Write a protein that binds this DNA or RNA. Structure first.
Ligand SMILES: [Mg+2]
Ligand SMILES: [Mg+2]
Ligand SMILES: [Mg+2]
Ligand SMILES: [Mg+2]
Ligand SMILES: [Mg+2]
Ligand SMILES: [Mg+2]
Ligand SMILES: [Mg+2]
Ligand SMILES: [Mg+2]
Ligand SMILES: [Mg+2]
Ligand SMILES: [Mg+2]
Ligand SMILES: [Mg+2]
Ligand SMILES: [Mg+2]
Ligand SMILES: [Mg+2]
Ligand SMILES: [Mg+2]
Ligand SMILES: [Mg+2]
Ligand SMILES: [Mg+2]
Ligand SMILES: [Mg+2]
Ligand SMILES: [Mg+2]
Ligand SMILES: [Mg+2]
Ligand SMILES: [Mg+2]
Ligand SMILES: [Mg+2]
Ligand SMILES: [Mg+2]
Ligand SMILES: [Mg+2]
Ligand SMILES: [Mg+2]
Ligand SMILES: [Mg+2]
Ligand SMILES: [Mg+2]
Ligand SMILES: [Mg+2]
Ligand SMILES: [Mg+2]
Ligand SMILES: [Mg+2]
Ligand SMILES: [Mg+2]
Ligand SMILES: [Mg+2]
Ligand SMILES: [Mg+2]
Ligand SMILES: [Mg+2]
Ligand SMILES: [Mg+2]
Ligand SMILES: [Mg+2]
Ligand SMILES: [Mg+2]
Ligand SMILES: [Mg+2]
Ligand SMILES: [Mg+2]
Ligand SMILES: [Mg+2]
Ligand SMILES: [Mg+2]
Ligand SMILES: [Mg+2]
Ligand SMILES: [Mg+2]
Ligand SMILES: [Mg+2]
Ligand SMILES: [Mg+2]
Ligand SMILES: [Mg+2]
Ligand SMILES: [Mg+2]
Ligand SMILES: [Mg+2]
Ligand SMILES: [Mg+2]
Ligand SMILES: [Mg+2]
Ligand SMILES: [Mg+2]
Ligand SMILES: [Mg+2]
Ligand SMILES: [Mg+2]
Ligand SMILES: [Mg+2]
Ligand SMILES: [Mg+2]
Ligand SMILES: [Mg+2]
Lengths: 200, 169, 67, 122, 131
RNA sequence: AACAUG
RNA sequence: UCGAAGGUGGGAUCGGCGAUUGGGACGAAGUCGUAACAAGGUAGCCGUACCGGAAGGUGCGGCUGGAUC
RNA sequence: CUGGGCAGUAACUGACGCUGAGGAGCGAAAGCGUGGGGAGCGAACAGGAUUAGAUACCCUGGUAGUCCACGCCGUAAACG
RNA sequence: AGAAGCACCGGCCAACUACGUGCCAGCAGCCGCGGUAAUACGUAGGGUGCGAGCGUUGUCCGGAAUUACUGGGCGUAAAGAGCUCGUAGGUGGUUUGUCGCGUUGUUCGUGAAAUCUCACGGCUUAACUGUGAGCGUGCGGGCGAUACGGGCAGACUAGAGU
RNA sequence: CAGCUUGUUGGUGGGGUGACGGCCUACCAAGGCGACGACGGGUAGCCGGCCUGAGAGGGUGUCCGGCCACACUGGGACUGA
């Protein structure tokens, strides 16, 4: 399943603009609904819960899928917030967002879901495909000379590209240098209140 | 600028010839966020006046908490009246696994990697005093070498000495 | 018991949950080819094939008999 | 106490009662539902509670509670009995599942509607 | 009666450390004297000597305090009681205050600490903790 | 002496 | 010879029912006293005996977990 | 007639110690059996008072019992 | 373009107002809510948590240090036998020598495969599956160590007794 | 649930079996087992594992894999490695 609902509504409740650029948000940054302008009780559980929601609606991950990402992140060496945001940053629909081929996250998900891409010459259509080190991310020859793929040819500049991946010229393809560590991760959220959420 | 958490606000009652006279107590934690924390009880006829006597009491009772760069140095077990709090260090990926009363004492003190378990009574006032009693039992690696007259390299394990090198370089 | 001896062996082993070393004692039967063994008598044994319903041991030799 | 006492006499876990008997392993258990009647609750909290004395296929006779408002149980309706205890009724540990063998679901439900038994809309 | 003289040895050290006494005397044995050598080499006590009583001998330990009245010994715990003996292997030796303390280990190569038995790869009976 | 109850 | 099943016999052992009867828990606005909590109006509790509608009373020994001048 | 304790001497023995499930013995008072004894006291009981009642408290009497010999009982707020 | 629902919103525990009802009808896991302005009953709007599912019942562990080895207690909260003697049993002062049973080191044999942990590979990804290494806490055989515990052979006088 | 045991415990000579053996038989001896729970009673296929738990533990034995037991109930042998 997906969410398939209003997107500004879950940025107002979480008090954080999750998509890139929104004029509906910042006219009302307070939570939606009819009791929205309240000064609410900030529980310790509320600060851990709403921090976990900030990552599910940034990346578009259901709860059972997001929990399995936590299962291996707590189980790998290093930290837990480092490795949870790493394996969320390695999903294919997030890689397409960081490379500039899509304006938002939800249009990055369809272009992977509708099968407009390859990775190692292999046709893929799964949005939670996790890329690894040295993975080329190619693109279908049918998907060239298409409107959403050529409307993102001239808009290659307004968003920055992170250091761990790289885009090239008119043969559009994305090269993964290594897995992203921490510093080149975009931060709307802290990474310790998610770890403290699953200890309850 | 400091960190503050109110832990409990209960309403207490005194009996007179007329009836019952009510009052509020408000246990407050005030901390540096880095290495210092203070506990102050405070009580008054109204809740914001009971909080403000607690904040002014907690700031006149700071104490320094020995850290390594995210966690405490060795496991301790503290004893209040009948509250028993077991503190225990942890890896840097851990958060603060602690109950709601001992969470406020450790987050205000600047602790990031803790395992805590409260083993005695469930009173929030005595769990806070038992967490404070365990933080006094902590003692530094450079202070346990001056206490023994040895260097630090043979009183402390090498695995936590490198966590001093990594924490500030 | 007419060419048969009874020997009290003993062995000590940890308790599985508590860790204390518990001392217990068995009682095995053994074969005397000639009936020379009385009460007391540290005896050495070696286990054999079934010789009766219960005898599985043989007497090797007597070291430091009954004082 | 004194490890040699624990060697001789170990630790014995304390005894808890079978907290829902008369189902005997089953999650639900059907019955015949004689004697539909109405009981008062305890010292506070007064109303008219709608209960029934159901004879199960566990070969036991239990008092069971009917949640929702309005029912159609008379004397020999097949009911499906689950567990669940009612605090103000002292001898009552079982509820009747609504939307079952003969128990019609509660009419005019539009909230929560899966308890109490109700299809969505026609 | 008198069971476990090593637990008496540590209780005498606690009851005078807690009372800020400068020294303790106690009956001598070669196991108490060798435990005093591990306590001196790890810096918990100052020098000890052997006087002579009526019968037997006497072990006298000079305790150590700071410039201020600081206990140079924090705790003492007996681990391997005579009612329950405690043995450890070289791969899972115990660890006192995360390594800030010292466990007295009785190996076949003499009395050692954790750090003297870990790098020699031996285990034995875990006598005491000091920290 | 004496005097229960709500 | 042994031998399953069956027959006969006297016991053992675990359940159900049983006229009548012993207490137990809980029901509301029942009836009769007021024994304990204040020196609770005779300080109270404990063991035991006898007695009494009922709580309880009295003896004998004991305890303070009472003794308020 | 008989049991235990303390101190001194250090004469002798050479760890002979501590604890002790079960078991055994002792164990206030009341009570039980047989046989004595019975001043005073005093359950039960009886009368008098008090009271709405008074199977109580208070008063006058009063049996067992309290004592002894020999057994049984094995309980106490047997408590520091 | 052919394809969204289910529970909950007094506290724990994320999410609040209106109308209807008036100790009624009902709710409820616990404390409890309802007797005319009910955030707790019924509907509505709004909201939260999840999602091809969502609740409920049953059952087990967790929380529960409420059987406590890790890791509890017994003056008054539940808990020291009325008191002693003593059987089995458990435990045992100082010291020499010895044995190597306990203990400890090492090596061999064994502890199947799967499952589980880790790292790579393959199914478009995942579940799933292939390989490698751990793990398999142990047990048996061999060879080292002798501090402690124990056995055996003596010494000692401080405990105990005379 | 506190006394169980007479082929019972041991020996000798025969018999028997693929094999040791009271496995069977005769004779002789008078033993064997038990408060470290005998003899009874109740329940249960055991395990690799599975679920839970920080661990130690507690619960469990379903798929798959191992061994065992049975084949309407009870008893028996035949054939054959
Ligand atoms: Mg103060
Ligand atoms: Mg305590
Ligand atoms: Mg508690
Ligand atoms: Mg009857
Ligand atoms: Mg009265
Ligand atoms: Mg009275
Ligand atoms: Mg009166
Ligand atoms: Mg009175
Ligand atoms: Mg009378
Ligand atoms: Mg009396
Ligand atoms: Mg008296
Ligand atoms: Mg001599
Ligand atoms: Mg004794
Ligand atoms: Mg006894
Ligand atoms: Mg007597
Ligand atoms: Mg008498
Ligand atoms: Mg008499
Ligand atoms: Mg007479
Ligand atoms: Mg009269
Ligand atoms: Mg009189
Ligand atoms: Mg009589
Ligand atoms: Mg006499
Ligand atoms: Mg007395
Ligand atoms: Mg809330
Ligand atoms: Mg209203
Ligand atoms: Mg509602
Ligand atoms: Mg799904
Ligand atoms: Mg349940
Ligand atoms: Mg539970
Ligand atoms: Mg537990
Ligand atoms: Mg307790
Ligand atoms: Mg005690
Ligand atoms: Mg009391
Ligand atoms: Mg008590
Ligand atoms: Mg006593
Ligand atoms: Mg008694
Ligand atoms: Mg003895
Ligand atoms: Mg010794
Ligand atoms: Mg011994
Ligand atoms: Mg394997
Ligand atoms: Mg894989
Ligand atoms: Mg792959
Ligand atoms: Mg596999
Ligand atoms: Mg070996
Ligand atoms: Mg003497
Ligand atoms: Mg015969
Ligand atoms: Mg023979
Ligand atoms: Mg033969
Ligand atoms: Mg024969
Ligand atoms: Mg069966
Ligand atoms: Mg636990
Ligand atoms: Mg199976
Ligand atoms: Mg099957
Ligand atoms: Mg059939
Ligand atoms: Mg044949």
């Amino acid at each position: 399943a997906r969410y398939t609902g209003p997107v500004t509504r879950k940025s107002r409740r979480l008090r954080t603009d999750l998509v890139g650029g929104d004029q509906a948000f910042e006219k009302r940054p307070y939570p939606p609904g009819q009791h929205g302008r309240a000064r609410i009780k900030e529980s310790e559980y509320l600060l851990q819960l709403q921090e976990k929601q900030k990552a599910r609606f940034t990346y578009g991950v259901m709860e059972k899928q997001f929990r399995r990402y936590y299962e291996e992140a707590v189980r790998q060496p290093g930290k837990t917030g480092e490795e949870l945001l790493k394996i969320l940053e390695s999903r294919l629909d997030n890689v397409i967002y960081r490379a500039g081929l899509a304006r938002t996250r939800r249009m990055a998900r369809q272009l992977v879901s509708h099968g407009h891409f390859n990775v190692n010459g292999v046709h893929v259509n799964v949005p939670s495909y996790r890329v690894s080190q040295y993975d080329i991310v190619d693109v279908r020859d049918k998907s060239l000379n298409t409107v959403p793929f050529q409307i993102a040819r001239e808009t290659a500049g307004e968003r920055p590209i992170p250091s761990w991946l790289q885009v090239v010229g008119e043969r559009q393809r994305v090269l993964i240098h290594q897995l992203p560590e921490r510093a080149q991760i975009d931060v709307p959220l802290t990474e310790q209140l998610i770890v403290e959420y699953y200890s309850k | 600028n400091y960190l503050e958490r109110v832990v409990a606000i209960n309403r207490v009652s005194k009996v007179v010839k007329g009836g019952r006279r009510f009052s509020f107590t408000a246990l407050v934690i005030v901390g540096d966020g880095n290495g210092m924390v203070g506990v102050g009880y405070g009580k008054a006829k109204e809740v914001p006046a009971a909080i403000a006597k607690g904040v002014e009491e907690a700031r006149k009772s700071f104490f320094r908490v020995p850290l390594i760069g995210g966690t405490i140095t060795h496991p301790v077990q503290g004893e209040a009246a009948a509250g028993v709090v077991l503190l225990r260090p942890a890896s840097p990926g851990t958060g603060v696994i602690a109950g709601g009363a001992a969470r406020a004492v450790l987050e205000c003190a600047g602790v990031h990697d803790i395992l805590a378990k409260s083993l005695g009574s469930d009173n929030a006032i005595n769990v806070v005093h038992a967490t404070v009693a365990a933080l006094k039992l902590l003692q530094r690696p450079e202070e346990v070498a001056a206490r023994r007259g040895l260097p630090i390299e043979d009183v402390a394990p090498a695995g936590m000495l490198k966590a001093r090198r990594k924490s500030e370089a | 018991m007419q060419k048969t001896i009874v020997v009290e062996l003993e062995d000590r082993m940890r308790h599985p949950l508590y860790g204390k070393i518990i001392r217990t004692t068995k009682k095995v039967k053994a074969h005397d080819e000639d009936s020379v063994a009385g009460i007391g008598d540290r005896v050495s044994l070696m286990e054999t094939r079934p010789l009766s319903a219960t005898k599985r041991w043989r007497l090797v030799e007597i070291l430091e008999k009954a004082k | 106490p004194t490890i040699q006492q624990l060697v001789r006499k170990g630790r014995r876990d304390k005894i808890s009662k079978v907290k829902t008997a008369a189902l005997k392993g089953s999650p639900q258990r059907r019955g015949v539902c004689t004697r539909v009647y109405t009981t008062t609750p305890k010292k506070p909290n007064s109303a008219l509670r709608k209960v029934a004395r159901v004879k199960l296929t566990s070969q036991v006779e239990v008092t069971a509670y009917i949640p929702g408002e309005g029912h159609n149980l008379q004397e020999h309706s097949m009911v499906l009995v689950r567990g669940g205890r009612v605090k103000d009724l002292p001898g009552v540990r079982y509820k009747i599942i609504r939307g079952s063998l003969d128990t019609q679901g509660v009419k005019n439900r539009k909230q929560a509607r899966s308890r109490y038994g109700a299809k969505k809309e026609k | 009666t008198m069971t476990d003289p090593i637990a008496d040895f540590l209780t005498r050290l606690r009851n005078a450390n807690s009372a800020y006494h400068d020294e303790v005397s106690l009956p001598h044995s070669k196991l108490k004297a060798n435990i005093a050598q591990i306590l001196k080499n790890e810096g918990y006590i100052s020098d000890f000597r052997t006087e002579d009583a009526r019968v037997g001998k006497s072990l006298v330990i000079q305790l150590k305090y700071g410039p201020s009245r600081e206990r140079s010994i924090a705790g003492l715990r007996r681990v391997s009681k005579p009612g329950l003996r405690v043995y450890a292997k070289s791969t899972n030796l115990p660890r006192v205050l995360g390594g800030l303390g010292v466990a007295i280990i009785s190996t076949s190569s003499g009395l050692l600490t954790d750090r003297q038995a870990a790098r020699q790869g031996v285990g034995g009976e875990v006598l005491a903790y000091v920290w």
